[PDB]
Amino acid sequence: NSQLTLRALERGDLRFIHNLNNNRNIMSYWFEEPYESFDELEELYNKHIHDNAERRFVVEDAQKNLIGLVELIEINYIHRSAEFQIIIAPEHQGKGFARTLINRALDYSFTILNLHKIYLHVAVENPKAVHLYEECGFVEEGHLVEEFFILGRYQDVKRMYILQSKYLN
Amino acid sequence: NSQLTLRALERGDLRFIHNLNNNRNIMSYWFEEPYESFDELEELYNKHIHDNAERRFVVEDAQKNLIGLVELIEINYIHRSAEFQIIIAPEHQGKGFARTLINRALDYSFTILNLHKIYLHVAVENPKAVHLYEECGFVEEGHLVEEFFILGRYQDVKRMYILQSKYLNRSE
Amino acid sequence: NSQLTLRALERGDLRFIHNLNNNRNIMSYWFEEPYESFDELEELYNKHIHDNAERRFVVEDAQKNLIGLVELIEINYIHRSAEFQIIIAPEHQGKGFARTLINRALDYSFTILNLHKIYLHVAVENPKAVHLYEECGFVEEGHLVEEFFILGRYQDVKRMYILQSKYLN
Amino acid sequence: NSQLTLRALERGDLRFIHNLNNNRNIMSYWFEEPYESFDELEELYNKHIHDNAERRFVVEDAQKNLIGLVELIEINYIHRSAEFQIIIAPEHQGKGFARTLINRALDYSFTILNLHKIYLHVAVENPKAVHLYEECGFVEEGHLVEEFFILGRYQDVKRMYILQSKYLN
Amino acid sequence: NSQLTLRALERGDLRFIHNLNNNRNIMSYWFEEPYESFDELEELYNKHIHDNAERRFVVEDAQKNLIGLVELIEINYIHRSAEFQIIIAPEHQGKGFARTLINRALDYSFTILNLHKIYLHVAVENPKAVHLYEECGFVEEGHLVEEFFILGRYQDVKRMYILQSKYLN
Amino acid sequence: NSQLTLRALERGDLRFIHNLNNNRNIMSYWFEEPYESFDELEELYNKHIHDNAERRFVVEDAQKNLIGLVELIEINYIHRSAEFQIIIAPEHQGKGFARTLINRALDYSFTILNLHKIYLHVAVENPKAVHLYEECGFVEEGHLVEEFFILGRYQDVKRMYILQSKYLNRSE
Amino acid sequence: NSQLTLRALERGDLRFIHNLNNNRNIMSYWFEEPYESFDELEELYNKHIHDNAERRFVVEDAQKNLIGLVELIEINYIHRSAEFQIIIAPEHQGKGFARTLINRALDYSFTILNLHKIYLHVAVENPKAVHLYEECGFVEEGHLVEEFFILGRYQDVKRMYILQSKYLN
Amino acid sequence: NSQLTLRALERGDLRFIHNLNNNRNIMSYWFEEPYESFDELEELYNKHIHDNAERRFVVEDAQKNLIGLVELIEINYIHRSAEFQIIIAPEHQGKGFARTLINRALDYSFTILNLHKIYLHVAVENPKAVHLYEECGFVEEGHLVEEFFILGRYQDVKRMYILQSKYLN
Amino acid sequence: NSQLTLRALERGDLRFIHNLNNNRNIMSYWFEEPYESFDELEELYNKHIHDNAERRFVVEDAQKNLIGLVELIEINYIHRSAEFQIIIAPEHQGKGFARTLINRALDYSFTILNLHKIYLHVAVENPKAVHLYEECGFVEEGHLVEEFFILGRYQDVKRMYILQSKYLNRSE
Amino acid sequence: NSQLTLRALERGDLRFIHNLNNNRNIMSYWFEEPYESFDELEELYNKHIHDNAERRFVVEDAQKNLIGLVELIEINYIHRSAEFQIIIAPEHQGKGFARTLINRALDYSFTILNLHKIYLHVAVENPKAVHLYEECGFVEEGHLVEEFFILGRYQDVKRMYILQSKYLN
Amino acid sequence: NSQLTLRALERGDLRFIHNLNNNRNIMSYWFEEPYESFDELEELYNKHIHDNAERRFVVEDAQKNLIGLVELIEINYIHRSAEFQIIIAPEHQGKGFARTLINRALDYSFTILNLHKIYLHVAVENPKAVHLYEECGFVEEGHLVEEFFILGRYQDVKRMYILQSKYLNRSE
Amino acid sequence: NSQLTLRALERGDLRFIHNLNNNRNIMSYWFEEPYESFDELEELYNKHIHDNAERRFVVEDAQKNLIGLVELIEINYIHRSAEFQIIIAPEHQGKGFARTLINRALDYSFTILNLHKIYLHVAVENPKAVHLYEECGFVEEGHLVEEFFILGRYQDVKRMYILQSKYLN
């Protein structure tokens, strides 16, 4: 866990991004633009390579195995808020890397970007993920009703948040 | 109030939008792009004239007086949702036009755009607005903590929503 | 009727088009691109000025009052088919001009463009329009179920057609 | 069947597409634009990479042999409708994979894209295809007369449809 | 007749061109591109303003009344040939201006452009026009069968020609 | 001859077209643009790759040997007509492939493009070609006087045509 | 003083900006690009109209007389700092508007932009301006030696600052 | 000599063009634009690859050895005239290829381009070249005085011509 | 004639050029590009506004009446030569302005442009023009055979020239 | 003299510039590009609006009559040198304003731009100008032989200079 | 240390710059544009390849090993000043190369760019760096309060400077 | 010496140019634009490929070892003047090739380009270079005072010239 590194996303990592999506079974977006193919993703990456509304980091281990992805989107530098997401490769989901990657993401958000609030969305139907984020310091601030359409159904999601003051202390 | 008519926004209405946003005292955005002056607004309008992620409508009375603005942003056509805002000009705020514009907005969103969910954000320190939207069918789904920096401090905002099934089948 | 003239649409007619589509109850499209405002219509008109997938004509009287619009869309020149739509201004709807405009459209489609088939969609809940088109030479070829979302509910539409051979003989 | 996988179309698949459309007997189109040569297809693919009016998926087996193509065109997101087409390679046509591909298409349309209605056109002179689509859940809603010019004569086609409610329940 | 002048076409004359077309009832082209609206024509004129494959001249009288149009198209400067057309305004068609405009057109073709052959197409169903051009020196070289589609029918046309050697002598 | 297959032209076939046009000894054109060298051809191909006013097809045998070219130009979709040309490579001219390519061209023009009339031009001083096209159904509709300047003198050309109704209903 | 309003800069105000510069006798910059002419300024304004690294506000009175200019430049939204400048028209420099405009500028900086630090540069040879800014809450943090070249000499400037915490309390 | 072939110039031949110039010691032009470097030539060739005012042919032998260059410039298709030039590689200048290449150039000019007049410029100080062209059918039509600046001096040149009528007979 | 002044051509003078070229009855060119109408001319002017291969000047009297045109084309700065043409408006042709404009043209070419040779072409069937240019210092250097096709036949043209050394040192 | 003001050149001043350069006897240049017509000057002004290699100022009197132009060209900011030129209108040449304009130019060059050396070229055949510049602080540093072709013959020019140290002390 | 050579930065050196900036733990900028990944850097390099507001040089030993980076930004040619930074690769930090690179940077700034003032910023919590630059001639001119947010808190930075007259005439 | 050849500069020579300018002690320029890196030089070369204001030639020996560079800049074709500069590689500086390269430059300038005057700048502190250029035909025409900032101090340079008449006779 202590040997996990965060590295800014490169064009060579887009293949890794693509494979992570085929498992999800939900529409994927790149700077709020939809995509399904690897070629769409690459075109969009070229387009938004300098846009600073979203930042992405590839999580690797010592042996450079691709462990997961840390995502910040909807970054607003006046209100100093950003939406946060984690995606661990299926083969690494049980090993307990999640809490380390969450802390790495919060560290970058609150120590370098100088953000004030980090929030996220967790499906209410996945209560173990909600508990995980609650142990990591997040608190529920909303229960969005039928917010997203996932596998043929409208689903609720917990919107949870953590402030910079609480993480730094 | 039935004299009121909702009309798609034109470039000629941008001055009206600019005068409305000067009194907000919170940073204004046009397709998630900040703007303060009229020239920045007009250029942003020209850039996003065909972008369907946001739709705006100005309401006029029979005499074509500019009453207010109806704003739909973050329009997502996979999840079929959007964020709604209403801005009545100061000189028309106390005339009871609010509930009429809200229902016009919901009717367009749920009948012509065939959207599924309409949500909005209301300052927690504005209880009369929260009650207004509750009277119109909106229900609180979140209490966002220190979401926006307003007048020198981070403030809370209620996120309230209404669904298409409710708006169209509640009286059946 | 005999003094109703067909004229290719010009930029100056776009205001007339915008007023006709103001009260329709369904999203208006220009070359399969949606629009609501006059400005959006004008830039779409500039973008598709030379696109021959659709052709539009304003009908005027002898004194050049604008009565309505004839629309040909989805024009395919391999199969020689096109979808037709007529819209008459509210002030001129009851004066009994529809049949003349319909046949003016058919004449242009079958005598100038050399098309083979003209079809149209009419709401099932507008039986008088269905009867009208039947009386002008159209025959039902389909009952599309829940094709369009109109006034808050999905509605059926009749697809009706007429061929070049039948009209020109 | 269970090992048949749906994958978003890539540029490398354009050769497979060109071979499928070589023996079809009708002009092939890419986003309503005609084409015959591979080079023309490739530049049309580049031009419409981000156009969401159509979505295409190649179906492969476990060993990644290309079996066929699923096509969604004329996608409207206000009315939530789309036209569907399946094309199986000649070598894999008799192996009885069609039903699996059809339902894979319906699953993506009704569980990810959140569409309401899927319709298709099938030649009247292909009764086995009509029966197949009927057996998979489609119902005839139209008998389009002389819709397409195929093999030197105009031919009728059945328009058949299925709704999201029926498939997901 | 001797007071008729030929003047190279200007943008201000496109309105005159447009009105001449509404009487014809046949598809109009501008450098082999179709058009119906005045706005299409103006866009096309701007596009091809320097293309030398076609040349056009407005025929005016002493009082500057717009009498007609002289057209040269498909100009080939290796084989030195060009297709020629005359269009007289309906109000001037009986006064006998035609022969003068034909000679003016041939004069420009054979004395300035140094062309070798000028040909034209006359509907066989208009035998008086065929006789006119025969008196002016043209000879029939072809009877094109069902060449053009005019008012719902395929029509034949006489292709007639005149050489530079014969006109200069 | 049934082994022969007609295939849409690709950029890789441009060298074949260039070698075919070197023996013509009459100015070559690509969408009515003159060209002499291969580089000019390749650039013109890139410019008109989507222009539907002309369509070209190369014919190959079972071994993928380049036999000839099928050319349709001046394609008009209002009048539904086009000009047709055939060019067999010198090393395959005497094998009797001509009539097979002509019928393949007519079949594509009249069944998939749904054209109404196909016409062509033949040098009057090439009587065997005129007879060939007559055998395939073409009829003379014009004798164009001094149409083209060829090898130092203006020459006549026969314009010959065939209609869709004939090609598809003659044996019924 | 209480009737002074701040208004975001418009293209129509560039003339006012230009006149303010002719009095200064120092090189003027627009988004770190030099300019002397009004035409240079207008071209630069068009170029950087959306750049958010600098913001400008015109100070007007009740009668809409142009009083001065408030300038924020070098805005960094990670470190949340910005350089601040005031320029009062010569005819209004003695009336005591300065302190009001300084507070208006700090108010916008600390209540809307959510900035953390605002600094400025004052010529050491203008000690009365240094005292003014010190009374308004600024403190000296640097004495830059020969930083700028003004009227033939290299001059020192006091760099003074104020934090958001101190202004809000 | 009978085994010499003319071939339209290709980009791969520009190197051969370049080497031919280094021997000349006079300023070289490409479509009336000057050049000295091979990179300038290549850029100019890309620019004017479709311009038909100049045509160039590489003369090769049976073994594909580069023998020379045939040049036509200032081609005017109304007056049907063009300037003609020959450049033989130094290693092939004595073998007597010149007369064959001159006839090949005239043949293309008068049998394919259908030109009327071909002229050229020969330095009066090279009387043997003047006699050669006179034997090949050219006649002097001018003695241009100090027309060109060559190796530090203004030099005269004979302008000689030949007409199409004389070459074809 | 000393009242006459030579001025660089402006876009406002293009109508004057167009009226001058209508009476030529020989194809007009603008930087070697053919043009017949005013719109083609104006577009060509915009394209070549900075091209220094040609320079043009309009001559005006004290009342600013448009008298004629001075044209220098084919300007080569390595060989330092150019082709010269003069075109006097019909209503001013018999006033003896020709020799004044010619010397103004030569003076600009040889003093400010520092050119070495000025040549021109004159129709052989226009002997009075040939004599005019001879009187001004031009000498015949060529009799071009069937150079231009004019009014239905190929005609001859005299090529005449004058050098800088002569124009500037002849009276010394 | 004291009422002579220096103003950065605007587009509206280009007519004044054109009139000054009408009678100069030498080709005029704009950023080393030649020009004669007003239109050519205006487009060159648009092209080099932001090019800082040259800076120009019009001098006006109190009533804003245009007296002349100050020109700085060939400005190098590494070596801090620039070539200077003054042009006074013919109507204002004898009023004795030159010295004031010269020093206004030197003040801007040495007090605002922070240049080190200003040099100029003056014709040897204009001794009064040479004496004038000498009297204002310039010293001859070169006698360029046959530098410029003026009035049909090459002429010498004096290059004269002055340094920042001497002027500011 | 005299073996060290200063060389203008090339595109091939961008990987070296990227590896240097990963250890900074403070947001990196390229012509005042933020960047984190190598691809963003390479694109920014292509955009500003000719922008003279910043100049960068990589130092190499005799074996061409990449030692460090010399950075000049905010270059102003009216005031003749610039901000200087030095970044030695971790594996070469303790070899005493710092003072050599600093003097190479000052020599280029004051002899070839003819600048007047060079200033730099040093974290107040890095006293050994402050002493290093003092040893090289830099003098403190400011103590910037809470200038930069570093590792979760606002920190102070010393602004230090040196003038051209001093660097070039101190030993005279 | 006789085997030293002049060749127009190519893109492949840009590395040789970069190495020559590495040790010069003065900012290098390409068409008056400064540069330091090879990449900056290469893009400047692409931008000015056709700009004739400057012309450069690499000198090679018989075995094609690169000895130096001849540079012509500030070329004016009205006045027919140009500034000349020679740079010899350090390895070939003492072999006594300078005079040959100088005259090769003069030959091209006076026999091909038809220029009138060639001038150059040489540091006053390089008397051997001054003597060399004097011995090759140059004459001092100026002693520019503090023209360039070299090695931390402003230095004088001699401007020396030679005319076409003197060289060619």
Numbering used by the authors:
A (entry chain A), C (entry chain C), D (entry chain C), E (entry chain A), G (entry chain A), H (entry chain A), ...: 2 to 170
B (entry chain B), F (entry chain B), I (entry chain B), K (entry chain B): 2 to 173
In the authors' words:
Our analysis of the spm-bound structure of VcSpeG showed these two regions form potentially significant contacts: π-π interactions between F32 and F149 and an H-bond between R25 and N152. To elucidate whether these residues could be important for stabilizing the interaction between these two regions of VcSpeG, we created three point mutants: N152L, F149A, and F149G (R3C4-R3C6). We substituted leucine for asparagine at position 152 to retain the overall structural similarity of the residue but remove the ability to H-bond, and we substituted alanine and glycine for phenylalanine at position 149 to potentially decrease the ability of this residue to form hydrophobic interactions. During our kinetic analyses we found the VcSpeG N152L (R3C4), F149A (R3C5), and F149G (R3C6) mutant enzymes still retained reasonably high activity toward spm. The catalytic efficiency of the N152L mutant increased slightly (1.2-fold), and the F149A and F149G mutants decreased 1.4- and 5.3-fold, respectively compared to WT. Our analysis of the spm-bound homology models for the R3C4-R3C6 constructs showed all three retained spm in the allosteric site. Based on these models, a substitution of leucine for asparagine at position 152 (R3C4) caused the H-bond between side chains of R25 and N152 to be disrupted, while the π-π interactions between F32 and F149 side chains were retained. The single point mutants we tested in Region 3 (F149, N152; R3C4-R3C6) were insufficient to totally inhibit enzyme activity. In cases where only a single residue in this region was altered (R3C4-R3C6), the disruption to the activity was far less.
